[PDB]
Amino acid sequence: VKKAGPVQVLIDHSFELDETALNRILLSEAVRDKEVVAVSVAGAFAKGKSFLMDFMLRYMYNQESVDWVGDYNEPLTGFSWRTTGIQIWSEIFLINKPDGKKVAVLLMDTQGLRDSATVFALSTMISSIQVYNLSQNVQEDDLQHLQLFTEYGRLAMEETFLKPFQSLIFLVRDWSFPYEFSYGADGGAKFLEKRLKVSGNQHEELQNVRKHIHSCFTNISCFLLPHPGLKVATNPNFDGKLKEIDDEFIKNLKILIPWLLSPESLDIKEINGNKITCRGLVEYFKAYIKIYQGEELPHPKSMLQATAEANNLAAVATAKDTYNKKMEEICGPFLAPNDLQTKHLQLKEESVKLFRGVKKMGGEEFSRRYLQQLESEIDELYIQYIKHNDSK
Ligand SMILES: Nc1nc2c(ncn2[C@@H]2O[C@H](COP(=O)(O)OP(=O)(O)O)[C@@H](O)[C@H]2O)c(=O)[nH]1
Numbered sequence: 001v002k003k004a005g006p007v008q009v010l011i012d013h014s015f016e017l018d019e020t021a022l023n024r025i026l027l028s029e030a031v032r033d034k035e036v037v038a039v040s041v042a043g044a045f046a047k048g049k050s051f052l053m054d055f056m057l058r059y060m061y062n063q064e065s066v067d068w069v070g071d072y073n074e075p076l077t078g079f080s081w082r083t084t085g086i087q088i089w090s091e092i093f094l095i096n097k098p099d100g101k102k103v104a105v106l107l108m109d110t111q112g113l114r115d116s117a118t119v120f121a122l123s124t125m126i127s128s129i130q131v132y133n134l135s136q137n138v139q140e141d142d143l144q145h146l147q148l149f150t151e152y153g154r155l156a157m158e159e160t161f162l163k164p165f166q167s168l169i170f171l172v173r174d175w176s177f178p179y180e181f182s183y184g185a186d187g188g189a190k191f192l193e194k195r196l197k198v199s200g201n202q203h204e205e206l207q208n209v210r211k212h213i214h215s216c217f218t219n220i221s222c223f224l225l226p227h228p229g230l231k232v233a234t235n236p237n238f239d240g241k242l243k244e245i246d247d248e249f250i251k252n253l254k255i256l257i258p259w260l261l262s263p264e265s266l267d268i269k270e271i272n273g274n275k276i277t278c279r280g281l282v283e284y285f286k287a288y289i290k291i292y293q294g295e296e297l298p299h300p301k302s303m304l305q306a307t308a309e310a311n312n313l314a315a316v317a318t319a320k321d322t323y324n325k326k327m328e329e330i331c332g333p334f335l336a337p338n339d340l341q342t343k344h345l346q347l348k349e350e351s352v353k354l355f356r357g358v359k360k361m362g363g364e365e366f367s368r369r370y371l372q373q374l375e376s377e378i379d380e381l382y383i384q385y386i387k388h389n390d391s392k
């Protein structure tokens with residue numbers, strides 16, 4: 001049987017990408033060319049990330065049901081919730097957006113000390129929606145963890161107003177101050193604004209993330225969640241059934257999840273102004289994995305170079321597939337040899353023009369290398385189209 005499930009894509013303290021598993025999930029014909037919403041939940045271990053993500057799964061499987069949260073005797077399944085890495089759900093959901101788009105929705109469960117910092121940075125660079133899962137309060141160490149993204153963001157915006165990151169959500173579990181800061185998004189926004197306010201008393205490097213974080217991220221928001229009740233907290237025989245979950249937690253959970261994942265809420269991954277497809281997103285995985293196998297985290301310039309690389313190679317992948325799709329429409333009857341070449345040269349130049357037309361990072365000399373990679377991979381496709389045409 002075929003069934004969707006969680007797939008380990010990221011695993012000495014070295015980190016390995018499972019390319020075949022990634023390609024199998026994101027390069028399938030149904031989703032490869034769809035623009036992608038990459039949803040991540042990240043943060044410290046044992047704070048309820050997988051639990052949350054399993055309720056997200058219930059919503060993505062029945063977005064239009066008023067009762068998506070589930071039967072109250074229905075056990076909670078999906079990502080295991082009771083080792084360091086990133087799991088993705090093998091069903092890449094195709095959701096109608098109100099504008100007529102079908103977008104692909106990828107869910108990543110990001111489990112993590114330098115190892116957890118690496119997993120947190122990797123998931124944030126890949127994501128378009130990052131749910132920063134925190135327990136009870138937001139503390140200065142929590143803010144500190146974002147400093148490298150701000151410094152990356154400063155270099156990235158030296159010459160454009162386009163922000164490198166999309167949505168970051170501070171999700172504070174087991175919230176402790178529900179009088180002044182109500183459960184939900186509005187109290188969250190009220191708290192986050194106060195917490196993010198610049199104060200002379202904070203260490204200089206933490207004033208820096210406060211000063212700069214909003215300029216790096218398209219949307220910063222904060223949602224305060226109540227404690228889920230004693231059974232969800234303590235019991236070993238607890239299997240996730242809603243009837244054993246505090247009812248104020250359920251009510252706010254039902255607001256949170258469409259707030260993050262409803263069709264109007266799905267933020268498409270975009271870099272340097274261009275929306276990213278599932279095919280393209282694989283290139284960001286492969287480029288970022290290269291710089292996350294050193295002693296410490298990469299420097300901002302190293303992260304910017306990886307974005308530029310992925311940005312160019314996603315352009316190669318698009319142009320190549322465009323040539324490849326149209327070529328197969330011709331080559332599958334039999335085409336006369338010089339006819340096949342005219343059409344090949346016409347089609348290869350079109351994909352060259354497409355590649356050139358993309359706003360790519362790094363500059364002309366940087367991208368000329370990837371132009372020539374594209375042409376070489378097109379020539380390779382063409383040589384094999386002649387040997388299948390000559391068998392006709
Ligand atoms: N205190 C508390 N525990 C929770 C909450 N949500 C889930 N849990 C419990 O936390 C335990 C481990 O959760 P898990 O999803 O594996 O956390 P993860 O490691 O961050 O993915 C389970 O017993 C859950 O029932 C919450 O909001 N507060």
Ligand SMILES: [Mg+2]
Nearest residue numbers: 049050109111
């Ligand atoms: Mg987890």
